[PDB]
Design a binder for this molecule. Sequence first.
Ligand code: SF4
Lengths: 305, 98, 93, 171, 82, 68, 155, 72
Amino acid sequence: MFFINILTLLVPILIAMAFLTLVERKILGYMQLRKGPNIVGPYGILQPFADAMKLFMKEPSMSLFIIAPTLSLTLALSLWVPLPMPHPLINLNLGILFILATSSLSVYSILWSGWASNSKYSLFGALRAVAQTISYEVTMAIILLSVLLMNGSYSLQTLITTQEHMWLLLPAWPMAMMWFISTLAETNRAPFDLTEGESEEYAAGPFALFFMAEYTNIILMNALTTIIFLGPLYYINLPELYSTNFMMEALLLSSTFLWIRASYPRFRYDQLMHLLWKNFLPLTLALCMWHISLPIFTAGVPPYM
Amino acid sequence: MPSTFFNLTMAFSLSLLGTLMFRSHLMSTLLCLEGMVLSLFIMTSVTSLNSNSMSSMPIPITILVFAACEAAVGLALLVKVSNTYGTDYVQNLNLLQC
Amino acid sequence: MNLYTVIFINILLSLTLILVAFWLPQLPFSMKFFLVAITFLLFDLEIALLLPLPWAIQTIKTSTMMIMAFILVTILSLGLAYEWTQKGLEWTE
Amino acid sequence: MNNYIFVLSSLFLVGCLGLALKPSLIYGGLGLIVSGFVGCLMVLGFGGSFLGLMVFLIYLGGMLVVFGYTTAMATEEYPETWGSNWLILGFLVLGVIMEVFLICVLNYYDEVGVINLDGLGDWLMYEVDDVGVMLEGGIGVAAMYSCATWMMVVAGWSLFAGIFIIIEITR
Amino acid sequence: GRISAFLKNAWAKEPVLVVSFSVWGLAIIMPMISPYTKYASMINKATPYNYPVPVRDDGNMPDVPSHPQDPLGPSLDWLKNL
Amino acid sequence: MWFEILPGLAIMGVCLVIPGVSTAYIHKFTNGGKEKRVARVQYQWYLMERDRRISGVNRYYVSKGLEN
Amino acid sequence: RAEYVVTKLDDLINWARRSSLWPMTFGLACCAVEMMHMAAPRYDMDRFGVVFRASPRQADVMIVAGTLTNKMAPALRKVYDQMPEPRYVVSMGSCANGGGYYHYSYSVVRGCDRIVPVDIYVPGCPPTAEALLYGILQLQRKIKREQKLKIWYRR
Amino acid sequence: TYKYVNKKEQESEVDMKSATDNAARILMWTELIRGLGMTLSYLFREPATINYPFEKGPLSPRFRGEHALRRY
Ligand code: SF4
């Protein structure tokens, strides 16, 4: 049974990541007025397998070389375990903290790659990206520490029974405007993808692994938003309906990422760290204090079963 | 409990040896300090959760924060040293003997 | 046992992928970075102090938790503003 | 899965031992990360979920990250590797053999003291509130906001001062 | 006048800080104002995470009731009437 | 035009919908029509171990009723 | 059988190396505006599973476009050595096939085929993006007509 | 007949209304959202792409490509 469930949780998400690469290519093409892949197969549903075969065909410290990508991918996959859809695979109180930990770790891979590659050129960008990722994960954590006071438990099931009536966006949107952005930094996506913008050491295989984990994290952060700030409908007789609406909103966010990647330019590193340290951190602290006071100058102090 | 506890104390002693004996570096010493701190935090939380005591739990948090700050200033000093000599070695500190 | 199974499965899958990859074919300092890492620490420690609110709030001394939270946040912001004014967030060398 | 805690303990021992036998820092930091992982898992097996996750989130994510950061940006693993790692590896092997035989010696003199091996699985949890909510370390760590406020204010001051201290140092 | 001019400037130059400080003030200040604050402590005192050990009647204490469903004890009806 | 992305959109949709219903129906098949109980505390675990002890089968997905 | 399915497997792996083509667009000069016009909408390079641009270490094909001087030869040979096997090449323009209008000059490499090998050639000054696509399809076919597994299994 | 770009016709005002609009555009990102809308527009349009081997671009009789000697 359990192995069956883990397969259902791991194989389809890899399939979806591949077809997500596809969807990216297609939407970017349609926004740049071109088509996109329409040839390898009907409307381009084989280009991903083509890329996989090609990469695994390409020729090339083994310790770091292997542990880094493996580590990143394993973390990205484990991140999925504790999610409710609607009843989760692993119900863990403190699940979102487990999420944050396993999302922050990959910095170790990013850093080992650099410390191995003697290239000063490589350490340059490695340090830069590591610092930006760290600094944005900080706020990624504080936002949850400021919202979850609405449900006095770090669980991920209580979110649903909370949002039963209303969502979590009509309030807290001063945060969603952030949690929908830091997610564009930890992922090193645009407009913060400088780590892939300024180039002057990832082989084919490890590059495939890095990219797999990157797009997995994309899907997963979008799902986290759809669960936290966009509460679905939990009518207990319709777990199917829950999963369906969740799918819809996840796809919507994953296409918003692409609207962004197409439209905007990239941020200059200094301008970016300025953005964070001088626009989001003060607001973040003040809004956390606000949501700390709310359940005191209002009866809305929630329970802990 | 007793077995794991004696082993944690052994690990503390080993970090002690690591700090009290060098191999021509400084980051090794500081990392051994961190190992000490980890073993201590663990032993304290274990003692607490085994006694079922709660009010005594803030102590691991406190000492962990203090170890973080301590190692931070230690790294700052290491960095000043490297940037005023040219490296983080230990045999460069032959001064002050006069 | 469950998380053990899942993690071993994920690791073994990744290693199968990498083994396939390997078989199928046949510097000065920048004080700013250290300062940023230090800010990151001195904020993670605040986070460790600050997480327990979802259980510190259901107690009876609201007049105490409210206060201590405000205190931590405001003094941290004071330290931040001082770092700013003394130019730890400028990046121009 | 009865030897669980003893195994995690031996692995923490070995991590601290690999740090005490100072190797190249790149292959010592891995030992430290393993040490933290295994210690957190021990805490979890005992029941301090909050504490274990706090560790995962702060120690690793906060301290080891910056340790590697600073090390790389301010260190060079000069060619001191005259098979130093390959020597201290066999030295570690000899030490671990010493320790295995040391415990197999102790267990004779001391039986119900140092270690109870025949009944190792026993003697981890002693009592527990079967019908009791609100018995997780979250409450003890939340104490600081109602009672024991001195801890919180002292840590706050430690940071409030560490900022100034670091900056005044670096210049 | 100087204050008004400074704020008319900041509200275009750097609003972020204005928003932050206003939120901070609101948070520090409203709890002293609103009437629905004490009710939180009342609630979290009412919530029985433990068992209410009873007592004997070797005296003439008339306050405590001989039965739960009786009315002689501390009520909280305002909770549902909220 | 823009109606050529559905052969990837629907694919991702189904392959993100499968895990949820998979988990639900599987938990239900195991625990006999009722979902998997959860224990955030020792209370619910005591209830579950009690039901296990009295199941007569040593499994907790059996609710007895009043015929015991 | 064995040889039948071996031929089929080779055809499939060629399917891969034929669809998932990634170029390094080493465009030095005015045979570059045309690569860009090609990756533009009206021909849409990507349509054939051929990305606009990408770094060498993960690339498969290499499009030379422009005069190949004696100062940018070394760099080019360096790139073609760094790139991972297999590595296909495509010369795009007179200047890079035979030195074009600068053949008889002193600071030109009279043919990129001296520095590096070649698998396809394309004429022009400039060419037309359509002719460039035709060259790339000739390349796809020069791929699909390979029998590595057969030659190994009869080595 | 020269001109002037990137310059206001005169000194600006300090109106609370103008500061309000500035603050809004700095917070809620009106212009960025407008850019997203433009990308959406072009998404919902017809693409100029063509299938080369089955459709070939336009030209004029004056082309210049492969060579050809001729005959009477
Ligand atoms: S062949 Fe003509 S178009 Fe091409 S690079 Fe040379 S001069 Fe430019």
